[PDB]
């Protein structure tokens, strides 16, 4: 099927399959072997035409995924041999070679905090590379892939900041006021359809070190408690987040900070169906589902936020998030307050 | 009937998603695919299983599935010593979120090998929880593990 799948055509410049193969082949079949397949299939009745088609495919796929050569000396070697071979023929007038080898902290308000947090979350999210997702699915750990590491650390720092911001207040009433404010922030994040930061803030509210403060939830407004319950119901684990998914489907326009559950889904689709069939050929529908699920995320990386923000104020908030507290000190403080 | 909330905890790359899938089907996006209606010890029951593939990194989601979760599969791979070393902090975090020394869970080895079953059983006995080993690919000693956790919940 390898020779059967590579047969994607370009009429001197012209598909969906082609895009899928070039983006998703690295999941199953290593790319160096694919490049060797192209070089070997190069040498073949009046078919300098298809040799040009091959050169155009190489140029296309190297230009679309320019990252296929940072971590892969083997692919670099084989494509260098490929361009040297075409340059060493001399025919076909392929200039593809010469064109190829070249103290108070938050005086803000609810909506403004939500919008600045959303702007940070979107800027850190937008830096995530699909090959980072590949490395997450295969390797099993984000590690060695900085963009999503920064995204997950962003969410963790948001939750930590929420917890320590609630616990930094003496008395259950002061903490309850902080809880009202964060519930309103979560409401505005739901209105803005930023569900990732919504998860971070809600879990900071629903964290065990915070949920145990009964006096504070006693002073918490009944409407606030109702909203918090509805939000926890929204981000709950039941039925692989079916409520979250119903909303996510029912959202539109700029709904698109997403949750790491997509990561989950990817991993699921990776192990549900096999990479390769026992025939020796690999079955594409798995890679098609994966490819469209990733292109969804890329398309989300494309759009623009509706709200704007102050870059320096973003810097101040980012500096507010980078504290150094562990679950140990957080629990020690929550215990010290009840 | 009775509904049991199961959570599959462990490091990535051990196959916990592959095992969880091998339990149910023979499309995870929908809510159906992580729910299995099966009959245990005479009576029917509903297994609401939750894999923790991408959710480990987020502390908030970690606490949500630990607070909602009723039973836990602390999974590791027999060919990875570090995967076996992480189970300790898994158990300690679960203890802090549940505030109890008697938490329903079951230790599972999965997939030569660098962990010997004697070590894992010594740890499982060290904190009074059953221990089973599986092969997600062929033998699928899976129903025994999940149903062991179900019985651990029922007998809490």
Author numbering:
A (entry chain A): 61 to 74, 79 to 108, 112 to 169, 195 to 430
B (entry chain B): 1 to 26, 33 to 117, 122 to 166
Q: Can I see the authors' text?
A:
One family of these GEFs is comprised of the Ras guanine-nucleotide releasing proteins (RasGRPs) that can activate Ras or Rap, of which there are four in humans. GEFs activate Ras-family members by triggering the release of GDP and its replacement by GTP. The N-terminal portion of the RasGRPs contains the catalytic module that is common to other GEFs that operate on Ras-family members. This module consists of a Ras-exchanger motif (REM) domain followed by a Cdc25 domain. As first revealed by structural analysis of the Ras-specific GEF Son-of-Sevenless (SOS), the Cdc25 domain interacts with Ras and is responsible for nucleotide release, and the REM domain provides structural support for the Cdc25 domain.
We found that RasGRP1 and RasGRP4 are specific for Ras, whereas RasGRP2 has a clear preference for Rap1B. Instead, we determined the structures of the catalytic modules of two other members of the family, RasGRP4 and RasGRP2, bound to nucleotide-free HRas and Rap1B, respectively. Comparison of the structures of the RasGRP4:HRas and RasGRP2:Rap1B complexes show that nucleotide-free HRas and Rap1B are bound in a similar fashion to the two RasGRP proteins, and that the binding mode is similar to that seen in SOS:HRas and Epac2:Rap1B complexes. An intriguing aspect of the RasGRP2:Rap1B structure is that the linker connecting the REM domain to the Cdc25 domain (REM-Cdc25 linker) is ordered in its entirety. The sequence of the REM-Cdc25 linker is divergent in RasGRP4, however, and the sequence of the EF domain indicates that RasGRP4 is unlikely to be regulated by calcium. We then processed the data in a lower-symmetry space group (P3212), The final model contains six copies of the RasGRP4cat:HRas complex.
